[PDB]
Amino acid sequence: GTLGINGFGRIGRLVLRACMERNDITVVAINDPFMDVEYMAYLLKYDSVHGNFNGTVEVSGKDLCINGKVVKVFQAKDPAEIPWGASGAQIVCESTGVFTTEEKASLHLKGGAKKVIISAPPKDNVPMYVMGVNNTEYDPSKFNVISNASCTTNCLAPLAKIINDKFGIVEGLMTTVHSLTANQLTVDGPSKGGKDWRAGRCAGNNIIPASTGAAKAVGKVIPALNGKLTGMAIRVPTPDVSVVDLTCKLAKPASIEEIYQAVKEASNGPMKGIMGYTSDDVVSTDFIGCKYSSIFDKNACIALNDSFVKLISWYDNESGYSNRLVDLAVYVASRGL
Amino acid sequence: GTLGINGFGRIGRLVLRACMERNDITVVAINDPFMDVEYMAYLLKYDSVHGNFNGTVEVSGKDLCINGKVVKVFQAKDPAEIPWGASGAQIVCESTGVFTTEEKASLHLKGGAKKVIISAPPKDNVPMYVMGVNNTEYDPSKFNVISNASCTTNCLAPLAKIINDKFGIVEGLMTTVHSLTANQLTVDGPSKGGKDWRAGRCAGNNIIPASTGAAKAVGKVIPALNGKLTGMAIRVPTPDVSVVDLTCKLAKPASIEEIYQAVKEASNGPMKGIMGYTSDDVVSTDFIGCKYSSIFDKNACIALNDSFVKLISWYDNESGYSNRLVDLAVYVASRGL
Amino acid sequence: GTLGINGFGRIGRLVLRACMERNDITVVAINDPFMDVEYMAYLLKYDSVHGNFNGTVEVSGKDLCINGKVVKVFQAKDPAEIPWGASGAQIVCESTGVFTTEEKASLHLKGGAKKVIISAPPKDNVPMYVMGVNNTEYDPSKFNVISNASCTTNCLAPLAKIINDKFGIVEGLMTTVHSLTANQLTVDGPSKGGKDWRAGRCAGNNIIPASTGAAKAVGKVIPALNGKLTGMAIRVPTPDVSVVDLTCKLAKPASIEEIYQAVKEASNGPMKGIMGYTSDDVVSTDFIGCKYSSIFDKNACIALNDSFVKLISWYDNESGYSNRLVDLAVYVASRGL
Amino acid sequence: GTLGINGFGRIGRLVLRACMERNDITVVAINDPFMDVEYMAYLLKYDSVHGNFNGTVEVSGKDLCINGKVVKVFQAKDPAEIPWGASGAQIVCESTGVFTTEEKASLHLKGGAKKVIISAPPKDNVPMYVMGVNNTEYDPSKFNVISNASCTTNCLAPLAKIINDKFGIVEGLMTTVHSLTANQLTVDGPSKGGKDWRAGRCAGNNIIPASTGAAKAVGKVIPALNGKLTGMAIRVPTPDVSVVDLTCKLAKPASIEEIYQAVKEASNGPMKGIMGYTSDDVVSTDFIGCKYSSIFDKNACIALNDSFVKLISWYDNESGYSNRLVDLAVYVASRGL
């Protein structure tokens, strides 16, 4: 099982770091036109959130040598031009943020990639898989280009699945309090695209409302919840770790204690490694580098009555997501190509 | 109408700044044992959020001279010892955070104060008034010690009143994304009281869940909503301005447009000066120094269906609250003593 | 005296805000291709540091109406294409950051501008004027394109002039602790140009060393100090206000008290409005919106001996600079064209 | 070699974490009256800078069990009352910040401690040792109570020793750009002691000048430099890692390259483990958890001429200092008692 990364950004670099921990997938090629091999080596070795790379990075010459293993480096604007097949890359992690359609992401298959995982929710009807929710619905004969959804969908959908299966979600509304991202700016200025005028405001001293499609995305991943969730985000100045705040009306009565046991039962059985739980007095920094998709915080939750609850789940939007994308690439490899 | 301030902290100092804008109430005495007159002058003249004091501050000698008017200064630990009557202070703004019972705050009446406004939700059954919600229920013959509730209750209760009167709230759950406060710490350490273990975590790099009684407080201020709201807070690193995120099931169908008109109608009529609205792409810094209790953000709100909505309202937790406390002191003066 | 702004960024917008306070210069046209008239109106009305615009902004139709006065708006990538003469703009404030040569900035004169002020230190030998230092050396018959230097050069050169004239600078080394800027990124990523690899690291949680040419620039503005100063910057997460820390060996003995009087004498005479001083326990937020170039902080300075001193001067890098650029445009207008 | 910790704050807790990495010293007792055993366990297991404790923490019952080893816990205000001898603690790390005299810190010897290390510069003439500078001057027959100096003195004195021995320091002035500390406040308020009025200003949005005695302290640790250094600090909002900026006139000519080799030679020989160096484009976050006292940043330094240089050295003020205090406790144990 071999992996190519297009776009060596926050997700592309932490996907690389996650594979270097992992014995059943290897990164064999990277493409990023806005950094040479030496700048790629620097942004890999040093991270302002995730700390110094655990291992060795050197430049061998238009290639990286990461823990002693050769990683071919490319600088191609066009996906059709990256020689993925020559490099021996079977799956491409597409993490540029700018090839989020089947039309655009399928051009990677001309380079000789077998499968493409988009690291984003798609602009079209590319199927989204979330690990431990609907990843086993994946059909290798039907799709070559798939999406791993967003950080937030990977947080919310495991929690929503547990809740819906055990109690039933009638109606739900999510807020995500979300750490800041590359789309935001250090000082007030024109947003790229003049599209989210608010995203362009000084990131470090503002609470910034954002639209997110994450909650409607849970309706694709869990069709039972189609039209039962919507949601909004609030961007805050912290550098990493985000929190989903899911308000739902339940079809059956459930105490927070009953919900906590339902979560604990799934975390210790079918969603081992994806869903986690805590009863500790935790704060966002406590999950930097957490590999779980979703950590249910028992003591932060509040119920109005047995039927109407607000549930709090943490997620490392950088590190948790990247582990899931590597999980899905391992899973997709096991199903053939 | 004359005002004494006990506790020259964030609320005590901005109450002073609000009165200096105001022609129908004057601050005549301050008490704070943890700052001398010269340090009081400094913390008044300079503010990291609210900017340089608009006017003159000098030390005349154990007294302040603020815009040319003498303000007597005291350094008394015990409220029974502050000579409020001698200084000519009729109302005491009690903003220490440590005399939030009738038992403790009534000791100010021994000093010759006529009325006490607690600048906090009380630990006992002191009545809470919120301006433009239930302030006209105040009976001067029945209470000498009253509370102005919290910043958050002053944000949520005007919005909840508008919504409940027009559509009816069945059930509601609030999240407040709240700017950081004096209870928090710059670095991880023992909380004062070892009570909110999470509040003691490094304030500047963490998202910190908090308990808040603000939403249950709306059930005292609006008895129709007793038991219909609860709520939680999330402390974030921004220095000022907070946002209430009210998820409610409504008894009547309402679009966000219908809710926006209901808010606009109340902001331009009975809640002039308390409730505001915006359709601009606003972010938290845009309300620093806003005197409104609550600014409804039309474009941040989201409805799941005609009956289940999430509403977003901003509030300057420092400046908006302080104006309301000065409003209530003016109102309480007009009712006698 | 009329002013056109090319580049409606942090400096372009605060130059506009400074002129709206000012009765002897008017902004008559703006050019920015990366924002339409409606987005320009938004970024003008709302500021995360400088607060809500003091006055009215509306869109009249591909034009702004700012405090009731028409400001023509353009969206041209090429300076040769902006019709400055048609709009009646005599001086162009060139604040894009990308036309910092005479070759590139002189193309504005094809549009019918008479004079160009670059809002940056130049990449070539365009002359730099600093107000109250060497602005009277300006020869209108010799130069049409001039530079206003940097924020830091405007802080350091008034202080260096006072010190050098009174005591004599033998050798000096500057550090500027500098608030974050549009060149920085919210999260770790490729710098624009792959040039300052460090500038591309997460701005909000890092102390970031930077190169600055500000101190060598003081050697152009004050030729007596050519080769006597160099300097470096440290970027820190605060949103605005910077501090120059000038370590100098002096040719004559001077106590900090003697230096404080020298500064006070110049602030109250020849550098009225440019150089300021404080003996208060000030912190960076206390100078947000300060119009001075340089505020000498007496109590932060330290001398090793009568000859070797470290001097601390604050500056609002956004607001102070923008006032100086408007000052220089008023001055340049008074000298002819 | 056994260690007791008085004061389980940032330094007390990271001293514990450093010993748990270390095979030649064991923490056997902790005293902190402002946290019970359960709150001590929480503040040990979770850290907003240093991440989750690497190992196990449980409460056995008024005792901790840390990686399976019993650590006795006390809650005594008075040092004379802590039974250090009963617990088997030979050295006491005194890290409260409030027993920084021989008079006060010697009361720990009544509890049956043999030696006391103050984790601070002393208010009196307690001797200061810095590891790899003057620690071998320590005489166990002459002193039972010693100081490990400050974080900054441990950064500056190794660098100053290398520079002075090789080139000679004529005169030097230090600035430290310093991460925020427990003395600072989240919002503007009275400083504890009304002493550093500036330290009491909102920590997260301000650049705050501070006095530091660190540079004069280098004159005790290196008597050759008595009266040759002074220095000041600037507190900035970052949560950890600080940078010393040493401007010195040298007695011999030295290029930054010659200084870099002098540092490299000492880092790889006599100051192995204390002094480090980097030529990478590093930023403060890159040294979180660095165990070095001082990391010389070649590419951030600047020389005016061969004789007058500004040198930049990083230090983790929390983690680097704590390792040095554990180093000194190991060293002091090896010399007898």
Ligand SMILES: NC(=O)c1ccc[n+]([C@@H]2O[C@H](COP(=O)([O-])OP(=O)(O)OC[C@H]3O[C@@H](n4cnc5c(N)ncnc54)[C@H](O)[C@@H]3O)[C@@H](O)[C@H]2O)c1
């Ligand atoms: N960071 C998060 O919290 C997060 C979490 C989940 C998903 N995502 C998604 O992942 C994607 C990337 O996010 P990010 O945070 O890493 O952003 P980023 O800006 O840090 O990374 C994008 C990278 O792609 C590169 N790139 C741009 N155009 C390219 C091209 N034509 N070919 C190759 N490389 C190109 C850029 O140079 C950059 O390094 C987005 O779709 C985003 O929505 C981000």
Ligand SMILES: NC(=O)c1ccc[n+]([C@@H]2O[C@H](COP(=O)([O-])OP(=O)(O)OC[C@H]3O[C@@H](n4cnc5c(N)ncnc54)[C@H](O)[C@@H]3O)[C@@H](O)[C@H]2O)c1
């Ligand atoms: N800041 C906010 O956002 C906010 C908003 C609404 C209400 N409040 C409430 O207002 C109160 C004060 O809040 P704050 O933010 O100003 O806190 P703060 O810590 O800034 O102010 C409290 C002040 O009281 C002084 N004080 C303490 N003990 C005293 C005594 N015995 N006598 C006199 N003065 C004494 C302290 O020195 C300090 O200056 C609290 O009850 C708080 O919950 C705060």
Ligand SMILES: NC(=O)c1ccc[n+]([C@@H]2O[C@H](COP(=O)([O-])OP(=O)(O)OC[C@H]3O[C@@H](n4cnc5c(N)ncnc54)[C@H](O)[C@@H]3O)[C@@H](O)[C@H]2O)c1
């Ligand atoms: N902010 C500071 O502290 C500061 C202080 C002094 C000087 N400066 C200098 O001023 C300049 C601008 O700085 P800033 O902080 O405002 O940056 P900014 O990024 O906020 O502003 C630059 C603006 O120019 C626009 N622009 C880009 N290309 C253009 C083009 N071809 N035509 C017209 N407009 C174009 C951009 O859209 C943007 O709005 C730089 O040279 C900078 O070094 C900045």
Ligand SMILES: NC(=O)c1ccc[n+]([C@@H]2O[C@H](COP(=O)([O-])OP(=O)(O)OC[C@H]3O[C@@H](n4cnc5c(N)ncnc54)[C@H](O)[C@@H]3O)[C@@H](O)[C@H]2O)c1
């Ligand atoms: N954090 C740094 O960067 C740094 C670096 C080097 C040295 N220091 C020094 O170390 C000392 C502690 O610093 P810190 O940052 O850990 O501060 P801190 O406030 O985090 O820790 C002090 C601890 O001492 C406890 N304490 C107070 N009174 C006590 C008493 N009578 N008995 C026992 N415990 C008591 C407090 O509860 C607290 O947990 C200070 O002298 C400081 O100057 C700090």
